[PDB]
Every structure is written in C-alpha cells, then in structure tokens.
Amino acid sequence: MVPISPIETVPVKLKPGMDGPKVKQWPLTEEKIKALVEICTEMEKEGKISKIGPENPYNTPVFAIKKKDSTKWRKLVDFRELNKRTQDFWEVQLGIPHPAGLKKKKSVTVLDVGDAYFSVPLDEDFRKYTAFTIPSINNETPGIRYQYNVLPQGWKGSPAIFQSSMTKILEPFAAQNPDIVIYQYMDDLYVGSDLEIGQHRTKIEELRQHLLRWGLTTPDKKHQKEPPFLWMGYELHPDKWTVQPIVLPEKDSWTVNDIQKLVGKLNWASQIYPGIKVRQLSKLLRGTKALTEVIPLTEEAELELAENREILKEPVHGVYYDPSKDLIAEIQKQGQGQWTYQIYQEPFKNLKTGKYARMRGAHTNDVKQLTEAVQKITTESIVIWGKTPKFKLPIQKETWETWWTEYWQATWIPEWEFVNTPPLVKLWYQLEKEPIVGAETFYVDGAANRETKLGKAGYVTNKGRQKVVPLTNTTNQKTELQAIYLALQDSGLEVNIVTDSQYALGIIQAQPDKSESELVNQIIEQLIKKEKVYLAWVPAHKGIGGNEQVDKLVSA
Amino acid sequence: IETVPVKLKPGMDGPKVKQWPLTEEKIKALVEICTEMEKEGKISKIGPENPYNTPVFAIKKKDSTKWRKLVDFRELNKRTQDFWEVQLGIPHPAGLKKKKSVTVLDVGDAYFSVPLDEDFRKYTAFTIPSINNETPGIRYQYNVLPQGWKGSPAIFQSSMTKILEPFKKQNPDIVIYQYMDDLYVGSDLEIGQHRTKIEELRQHLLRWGLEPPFLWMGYELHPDKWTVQPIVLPEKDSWTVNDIQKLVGKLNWASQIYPGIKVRQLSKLLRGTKALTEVIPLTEEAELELAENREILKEPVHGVYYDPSKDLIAEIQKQGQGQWTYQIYQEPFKNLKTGKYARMRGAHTNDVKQLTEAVQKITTESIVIWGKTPKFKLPIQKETWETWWTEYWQATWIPEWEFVNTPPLVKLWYQ
Numbered sequence: 001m002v003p004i005s006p007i008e009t010v011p012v013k014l015k016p017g018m019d020g021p022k023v024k025q026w027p028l029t030e031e032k033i034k035a036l037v038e039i040c041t042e043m044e045k046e047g048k049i050s051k052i053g054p055e056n057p058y059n060t061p062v063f064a065i066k067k068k069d070s071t072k073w074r075k076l077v078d079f080r081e082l083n084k085r086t087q088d089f090w091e092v093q094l095g096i097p098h099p100a101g102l103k104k105k106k107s108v109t110v111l112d113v114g115d116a117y118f119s120v121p122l123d124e125d126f127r128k129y130t131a132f133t134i135p136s137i138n139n140e141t142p143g144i145r146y147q148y149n150v151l152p153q154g155w156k157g158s159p160a161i162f163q164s165s166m167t168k169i170l171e172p173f174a175a176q177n178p179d180i181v182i183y184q185y186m187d188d189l190y191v192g193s194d195l196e197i198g199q200h201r202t203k204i205e206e207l208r209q210h211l212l213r214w215g216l217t218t219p220d221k222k223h224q225k226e227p228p229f230l231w232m233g234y235e236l237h238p239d240k241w242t243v244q245p246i247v248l249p250e251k252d253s254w255t256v257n258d259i260q261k262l263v264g265k266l267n268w269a270s271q272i273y274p275g276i277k278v279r280q281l282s283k284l285l286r287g288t289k290a291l292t293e294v295i296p297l298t299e300e301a302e303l304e305l306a307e308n309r310e311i312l313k314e315p316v317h318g319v320y321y322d323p324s325k326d327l328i329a330e331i332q333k334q335g336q337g338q339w340t341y342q343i344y345q346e347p348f349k350n351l352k353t354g355k356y357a358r359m360r361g362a363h364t365n366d367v368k369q370l371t372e373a374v375q376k377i378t379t380e381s382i383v384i385w386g387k388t389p390k391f392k393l394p395i396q397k398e399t400w401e402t403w404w405t406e407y408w409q410a411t412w413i414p415e416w417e418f419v420n421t422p423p424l425v426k427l428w429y430q431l432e433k434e435p436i437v438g439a440e441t442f443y444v445d446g447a448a449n450r451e452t453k454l455g456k457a458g459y460v461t462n463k464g465r466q467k468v469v470p471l472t473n474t475t476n477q478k479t480e481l482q483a484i485y486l487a488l489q490d491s492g493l494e495v496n497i498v499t500d501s502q503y504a505l506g507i508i509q510a511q512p513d514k515s516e517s518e519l520v521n522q523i524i525e526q527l528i529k530k531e532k533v534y535l536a537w538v539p540a541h542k543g544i545g546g547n548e549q550v551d552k553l554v555s556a
Numbered sequence: 557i558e559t560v561p562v563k564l565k566p567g568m569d570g571p572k573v574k575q576w577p578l579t580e581e582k583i584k585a586l587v588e589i590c591t592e593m594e595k596e597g598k599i600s601k602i603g604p605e606n607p608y609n610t611p612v613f614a615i616k617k618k619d620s621t622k623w624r625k626l627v628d629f630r631e632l633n634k635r636t637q638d639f640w641e642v643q644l645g646i647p648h649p650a651g652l653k654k655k656k657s658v659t660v661l662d663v664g665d666a667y668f669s670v671p672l673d674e675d676f677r678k679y680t681a682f683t684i685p686s687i688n689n690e691t692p693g694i695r696y697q698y699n700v701l702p703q704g705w706k707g708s709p710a711i712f713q714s715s716m717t718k719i720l721e722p723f724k725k726q727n728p729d730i731v732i733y734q735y736m737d738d739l740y741v742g743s744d745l746e747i748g749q750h751r752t753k754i755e756e757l758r759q760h761l762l763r764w765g766l767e768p769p770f771l772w773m774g775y776e777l778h779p780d781k782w783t784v785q786p787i788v789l790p791e792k793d794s795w796t797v798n799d800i801q802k803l804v805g806k807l808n809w810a811s812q813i814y815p816g817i818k819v820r821q822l823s824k825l826l827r828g829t830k831a832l833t834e835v836i837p838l839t840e841e842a843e844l845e846l847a848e849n850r851e852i853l854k855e856p857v858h859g860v861y862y863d864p865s866k867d868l869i870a871e872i873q874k875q876g877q878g879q880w881t882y883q884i885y886q887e888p889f890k891n892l893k894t895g896k897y898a899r900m901r902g903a904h905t906n907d908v909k910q911l912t913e914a915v916q917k918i919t920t921e922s923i924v925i926w927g928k929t930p931k932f933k934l935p936i937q938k939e940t941w942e943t944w945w946t947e948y949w950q951a952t953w954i955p956e957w958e959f960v961n962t963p964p965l966v967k968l969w970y971q
C-alpha cells in the first residue's frame with residue numbers, strides 16, 4: 001500500500017462543569033431493531049463506530065426512520081442532549097460570499113468529497129460521550145453498545161471540525177495554484193478558473209492526486225451538478241448571477257403569514273431587482289403578531305404591490321466583480337423614508353442593488369437619511385469588495401457643504417459626485433445665526449396644568465402684537481411648541497422668536513423636515529415659507545422681560 | 557522566560573467579539589505581518605476548538621508609511637484579572653504633566669520577548685478575514701505578550717525597570733512613565749538636548765534587544781504649554797437685548813458651577829418687550845452685578861478633586877471652522893480639565909477625521925495627568941463613527957465611547 005498522511009484530531013471538551021449525556025434508550029419494534037443491527041454492523045465494518053464494554057456510563061438515544069416509499073430503514077442518533085453539553089466551536093460558515101463579490105470564471109467543476117468526511121477521526125478522549133445502545137430482541141440480552149470513531153452526523157462539532165480539516169488539506173494546493181479558486185459547501189468542493197479547459201481539467205486531476213495523500217477518494221464519474229448552480233437562494237452562472245425565481249402569489253385576502261413571507265421575498269429580490277419597496281406592506285404588521293389574522297390591505301399597499309409585480313415581470317441578472325475597475329454606487333430617494341441604490345462598474349450592468357429604510361424615530365430629515373444610506377452601502381461594500389465605492393448622490397455639492405459645516409454633529413460622506421436625477425435632496429430651511437434688524441420680535445411661551453390637561457400658548461411682540469390661545473388635552477411641552485407655531489403663523493417673512501423651551505430647541509436644532517408629531521410638522525411647514533428666522537433661547541423664570549410677560553399670560 | 561500565571565475574572569468567559577469589515581489593503585498588510593510573526597514564533601495557527609475572538613485591524617503610526625497591526629483588546633482587558641500581586645499599582649507620577657517636553661516612545665515590540673502563559677493563550681485569538689468571505693479566515697493566537705493587552709505592561713514591568721536602571725539614575729531628573737505600549741519621558745531640558753537623550757534612551761532597548769520596527773519614532777508633547785479654559789464674559793460698550801439675553805443665559809449656566817452668580821439686576825434690564833437688536837444701556841446695579849460675576853469666575857471651582865476609583869468622562873463639542881471644545885470630569889459641573897482645539901491636522905474638509913484626532917489628543921492628555929483613559933461622549937451618529945474612525949486612528953490604545961444624539965445647549969457657552 002501507499003502510506004497516507006493522517007488527519008490530526010481536534011481536541012474536544014465538554015462545557016466546564018458538565019458531564020456526558022445519560023439519556024434513556026427508547027423501546028423499539030423488533031423490525032426496527034434488526035434494521036439498526038444490520039446498519040450498525042456495516043458502519044463498524046467501515047470503521048465509523050466500535051462496540052464497547054459495559055463500563056461506559058453514557059448513552060444517546062437511537063431511532064429507526066422508514067425512508068419514504070422504500071423498504072429500507074435509516075438510522076438517526078439523537079445527539080440533542082450531547083450537543084447541549086459540548087463546547088462552543090469557531091464557525092467559519094459565519095458569512096456567505098455574496099455573488100456580487102465573486103469573479104467571472106470560464107470553468108467551474110464540482111468534486112464530491114462525501115467519503116472524505118468519515119476519514120476525519122473524532123478526538124479519542126471524546127468518543128466515550130457518543131455512546132449509544134441498540135435494544136436487544138425481547139430485552140433478554142444486554143443491548144449492543146457502540147461509540148463513534150468519526151464525526152457523527154448531527155453532532156455539534158462535526159461541521160466546524162470537517163471544514164477546518166479540509167481547509168488545512170487544501171491550503172498548500174490553493175497557495176501553490178493561485179490561478180484557481182476553491183470553495184467548500186456541504187460534501188462538495190467547487191474549483192473555478194480562467195484556464196483553458198485542458199489546463200483546468202489538469203488542475204482538477206492534480207487536486208484529486210493531492211487529496212489522495214490523505215487517502216481521500218473522489219468519484220471518477222464526474223459530478224452531475226453543473227452550471228447553473230442553485231446555492232443559498234441564488235442562481236450562479238459562469239458570467240452572471242441572479243436570485244432564484246421570485247413569484248408573488250395571487251391572493252384575494254392576505255394573512256399576517258402571507259405578508260411576512262411576501263416582504264421576505266421582496267427583501268430577497270431587492271438585491272438585484274432595482275426599486276423594490278416594502279414600507280407600505282411592512283406597515284400592516286405593526287405591533288401585531290397573531291399568525292393567522294387577516295388584515296385589509298390599504299390602497300397604499302396595493303399600489304406598492306402592483307409596482308413590485310411590475311418590477312418582477314422578467315428576469316434580471318447581475319454581473320461579477322472586476323477588480324480592475326472602480327465601484328460606483330448611486331442612490332435615489334423613493335419617498336416615505338425609502339431609499340434605493342445600485343452598485344455597478346460599467347453603465348447599465350449592476351453588480352447588485354439594494355434598499356435602505358428610515359429608522360423609526362421622532363424626527364429626521366432627508367440629508368440624515370442619505371448619510372445613513374451611504375454608511376450602510378459603505379460597510380456592505382467593504383464586506384463584499386474590500387473597498388468603498390465612488391458615490392453618485394442626488395444632492396448638490398453646495399447643499400452638502402451648507403449642511404455639514406453648520407450641523408452640530410460631526411458627519412462625513414466619502415468621495416462622491418452630484419447626479420442630477422430628481423427628487424433632489426435639499427435643505428428646506430436654515431435658521432439665522434444673528435438677530436434680524438427690522439424684524440418683529442416674538443416672545444413666546446406656553447404652559448399646561450398637569451392634572452386637567454388644560455393649557456395656554458401665545459406670544460407678545462415689541463410692536464404690541466399679542467395672542468393667547470386656550471388649549472385642551474395638552475402638556476407643557478406641547479404648549480411650548482404650539483406657542484412657537486403661533487408666532488410663525490402671525491409674523492411676516494422675517495421674524496425673531498424668543499423662547500425658554502429647551503425641549504423645543506433640542507428639536508429644532510436637530511433640523512428635522514418631517515416628524516412623528518404633527519405639531520412639529522406644522523412648525524416645519526411654517527419655517528419653509530419664511531425668508532429669515534432667528535430662534536433665541538433664554539432661561540425661564542428669571543425676570544427676563546418679554547418672556548416674563550407672556551409667561552404670566554399663558555400660566556394663568 | 558518563565559510564564560507568569562494569569563487568569564480571567566471569576567465567572568467570566570473569554571472574549572467572543574466579531575471582526576469588523578476590513579479593506580483589501582489592510583487585509584494584505586495583516587497577512588504579511590502575521591506571516592512574519594508566525595515565522596518568529598510570536599503567534600500560532602489555531603483550530604476550531606478555540607471559540608474566542610478579538611477584532612484586529614491595521615493603522616499607520618503618525619509620520620510613517622509602514623502598516624502596524626493593532627488588536628482591539630478592549631473586551632479582553634475588561635475580562636482579565638486585575639494585577640496587584642507584586643505591586644498594588646504604579647502610583648501615577650504627578651510630575652510628568654509638569655515637565656515641559658514629554659516624548660512618547662513605542663516600546664510595545666519589547667513585549668514579544670516574553671512568553672505568554674500557555675493556558676491563557678487561547679483567549680488572545682483573532683481572525684484575519686477574507687474579502688467577501690470567499691476563503692476561510694486565518695485564525696491565530698499569541699504565544700508571547702501581545703501589544704494592547706493590559707497584562708503586557710504588568711508582566712513586563714519587572715523587566716522594564718532593570719533595562720532603565722542605568723539611564724534613570726544617570727538622569728535622575730527625568731520622568732519615565734509606561735502606559736500600554738507607550739513610554740512617556742518628560743524633561744525640563746532644551747529640545748535639542750531632549751531628542752538626543754531620547755535616542756540615548758533608544759540605546760538601551762536595542763542594546764538589550766540583541767529589531768523593533770517603530771522604536772525609532774518620537775511623539776513630542778509640551779504639557780507645560782497646555783491651555784486651560786476659564787469662564788469669561790464679554791466686554792462691550794453697547795449691549796443689545798440679544799447680547800444681554802445670551803449673557804444671562806451663560807451666567808445662569810455658570811451658576812450651576814459657581815455658587816454666588818446673580819443675574820437679577822441684569823435681567824431687570826430686559827423689563828418690557830423690546831426688539832432683539834435694540835441697544836440697552838447698562839444700569840449701575842447691573843454693571844456691579846456683572847463685575848461681581850467677573851470676580852467670581854476668576855477663582856477655581858469649589859470641591860473639585862480627582863478620585864482614581866471613578867471613571868473619567870470626556871465630552872466634546874463641535875464649534876465649527878475646525879474648532880472643538882472638550883471637558884474632562886468625573887462629577888457633573890466639576891471639570892478636572894477643559895480645553896479647545898483648532899489646529900486639527902489635514903482635515904479641513906473631514907469632520908470625522910478631526911473628531912478622531914481630537915479623541916486621540918484628549919486621551920493622550922488624560923494618560924499623562926491621571927494615567928488612564930476617559931470614556932468619551934461623542935457628538936456623532938454611532939454608524940458614522942464606527943464606519944470611519946479606524947481610518948484615522950494612529951494610537952496603540954483604544955478608549956471607550958458612547959454617542960450623543962441630542963444637541964447640547966452648553967455648546968453656546970464653551971465657544
């Protein structure tokens with residue numbers, strides 16, 4: 001024989017303070033017991049398991065499942081209890097490769113490594129914890145006791161240890177053949193290259209040889225699976241990729257379940273199908289989670305669904321990454337806090353698409369949302385391609401400079417250029433930095449009774465203009481906002497406004513253009529119509545004239 | 557040469573932190589560095605039975621073109637034991653902040669000469685990721701004292717003092733303080749003299765060493781010139797209504813910090829409902845009240861003390877035009893130090909690079925005065941900061957930070 005290199009075992013431990021499993025073996029029919037005996041005898045012939053003496057105190061239940069539409073049974077060792085007691089492992093399958101980051105390949109061959117899996121031995125000191133028992137016929141003899149010598153199917157550490165064992169085997173072959181790509185998924189190895197099919201098939205045979213150094217055989221009758229590959233919900237072709245078919249169902253009535261799976265399909269399709277929107281459909285699941293209840297779909301939801309059906313009429317494909325060309329990312333505003341983007345290298349051939357939704361919060365504006373969408377695309381691009389794309393944004397360079405220089409927070413967008421495709425992101429108002437000469441000065445204030453919810457809001461001005469409005473079902477914070485709204489309502493196009501509300505300033509200094517409070521939205525609408533607005537703050541209850549006068553009027 | 561026994565804290569598992577995304581240039585740099593470190597035995601490949609992980613990335617130290625590997629041991633450092641076996645601690649030298657030239661030296665590569673306890677090495681696990689996760693991440697662990705781990709200076713301290721024994725008693729005047737991978741040396745000498753005793757210092761570490769890649773560097777500070785911020789009120793000949801409102805607002809704020817601040821006569825000047833731009837003459841009662849407040853603001857704050865058992869907190873405000881203000885405190889309104897920056901380096905168009913450099917300079921100041929880093933309250937969205945701060949980081953340590961989402965009105969009073 002030819003000597004083969006052994007696969008070094010991974011030392012496995014149980015979690016600290018825990019012991020192995022000691023679970024009862026279920027009673028089995030006489031027909032199931034025979035089937036397990038013949039199955040386990042074959043596994044023992046192949047070296048997968050070994051019979052053990054009675055001193056081993058551990059046990060894991062075994063079952064026999066009828067392979068549907070066949071007279072052949074199949075074994076199942078229920079390692080659920082041992083998995084609870086097995087240590088945590090490093091899981092490399094943490095992050096899938098995104099197809100948009102892959103490179104085009106002329107040839108991609110598949111090799112089966114199913115036999116190589118049980119050539120990976122289990123740590124000798126851990127094998128005792130995998131003990132199981134086949135019940136004897138009529139319970140008149142001791143049951144047959146086995147333990148595993150290889151990675152058992154269903155055990156917690158089997159995927160991680162197999163992947164790491166094969167990784168260590170493939171490392172020298174990949175390093176010394178940099179003109180090929182190798183990827184492992186389940187019991188298969190995928191080898192791609194740009195080599196001519198003669199040189200490519202030579203590399204495949206060289207890989208088969210290299211695998212025999214460890215005694216791992218691969219089937220000679222080459223794999224039936226061939227491009228395209230159905231993999232992780234994608235369709236992989238040699239020079240293109242897409243998602244597996246997205247079919248939106250026809251339904252006269254929709255359930256919470258139907259909408260949950262509908263948004264999931266739309267989210268999955270949004271990575272290559274441009275312009276997918278899910279806000280109005282996702283609004284219908286707000287707060288409630290009774291799986292079977294029916295929800296009437298709003299007219300806003302039927303339009304969004306009809307728009308999505310029109311986007312999904314015909315297939316759309318993405319191209320693969322060319323490292324020799326720049327990445328370009330373009331963003332568009334869709335409305336209602338929805339943003340869509342495309343990432344490409346050559347015009348009209350996207351690598352991938354995507355979308356971004358506004359975070360739920362009290363107040364926000366378009367510039368903040370565009371900034372957040374840029375940071376999400378940036379991070380996603382570092383993951384997939386290892387570099388930041390050049391951005392094409394629907395915001396003028398002058399608008400951005402005005403925003404970030406005056407915004408109270410530090411903010412930054414990477415290298416970008418303006419693209420003139422409406423709707424453009426703009427600033428709807430900008431407060432003055434100094435008081436306005438000639439503009440009327442409005443001293444506003446509001447107050448409310450915490451028990452009766454009754455309050456007043458109003459203002460007094462330097463020209464003698466006054467107003468106090470009685471209010472019901474309001475709070476101290478609402479009256480302070482209402483008072484500012486009244487000053488904006490009753491003033492000319494330039495106005496100075498003096499308030500003592502730290503609450504109202506914390507809102508307005510955040511510069512929102514849309515809010516969850518309609519009262520703030522009315523103030524924003526008033527601010528947009530003005531020419532000049534100066535907002536000044538003073539502390540309350542300090543004898544500040546103007547503020548002191550209106551406070552007595554509104555707190556009465 | 558013999559490992560010191562090291563344990564975590566009771567009822568505490570190792571770190572399991574996710575490796576954040578890295579650019580192509582940083583991955584290739586880390587692969588080249590770790591390949592060399594593996595050849596020199598500093599690190600070793602690990603298997604899947606090690607579930608722990610600590611993030612890693614690469615930087616460029618100030619004034620150099622070579623990549624430096626930096627491990628973010630923040631989570632591990634929280635979880636390792638506190639070492640008071642030989643010394644309860646290093647009583648922080650209060651004289652370092654009073655020398656007029658302090659140079660920072662990167663001596664972290666000297667840690668690699670001491671092996672790490674075999675049972676603790678698994679907790680230093682880190683991963684070199686691959687682009688698009690196309691190839692399995694490269695998994696390493698440390699065989700020697702790692703840079704950035706709080707146990708490295710504690711374990712190596714026994715060796716460091718003996719290396720510096722010939723230099724320190726030759727130059728008794730000179731203050732030497734170690735924080736993590738950094739060595740701060742303060743002197744009262746002239747700078748031309750200063751840099752050559754800096755390299756005189758470098759003599760000892762390469763002499764024993766037999767090469768450290770970043771030992772030839774020097775970060776020159778001047779803690780004697782470090783400027784304070786006292787509260788100052790405007791001096792005007794004509795005061796508008798808006799001017800007096802802003803003044804009363806600032807004085808009301810200072811009254812939380814200083815007891816005897818009064819605003820009653822100044823507020824009376826606002827009696828009526830006047831235009832914001834109208835000039836108001838100061839009454840006498842108001843001028844005296846203003847002068848009395850000026851006198852109060854020239855004294856220090858009462859009951860201000862540093863407590864080494866409490867965390868230092870650093871707040872930062874963006875003032876515009878590349879200027880930033882900051883305050884270090886442990887209790888509200890009890891500022892231990894305040895300052896202001898404007899000379900922010902090569903980022904007149906990048907807010908985040910300015911803030912990242914402000915954080916590093918404030919942390920450097922905090923290390924010199926108190927010997928520990930503060931927890932920052934950053935005026936930036938979390939997603940914006942975490943995307944970009946690693947691109948402008950040049951220090952070997954990393955402080956803690958939280959994010960401010962509400963605009964502080966105290967910014968009006970620190971400009």
Ligand SMILES: Cc1cc(/C=C/C#N)cc(C)c1Nc1ccnc(Nc2ccc(C#N)cc2)n1
Pocket residue numbers: 097102103104105108181182183185190191192227228229230231236237238239320690
């Ligand atoms: C991640 C991955 C999944 C499969 C697929 C697993 C399955 N099922 C096959 C391979 C070879 C890879 N690895 C890599 C690495 C770099 N570029 C590429 N490009 C690439 C991959 C497939 C096709 C095709 N057809 C074309 C180009 N693949």
Ligand SMILES: O=C(O)c1cc2cc(F)ccc2[nH]1
Pocket residue numbers: 166167168170171174175180181182183691692
């Ligand atoms: O470059 C590759 O395709 C590659 C590198 C590599 C290293 C391993 F350890 C296993 C598979 C691999 N594939």
Ligand SMILES: O=C(O)c1cc2cc(F)ccc2[nH]1
Pocket residue numbers: 398399400402425426427428429430
């Ligand atoms: O760039 C803009 O959109 C913008 C700038 C600006 C300045 C103002 F004074 C008022 C509104 C604005 N909008």
Ligand SMILES: [Mg+2]
Pocket residue numbers: 445446447500540541551
């Ligand atoms: Mg009031």
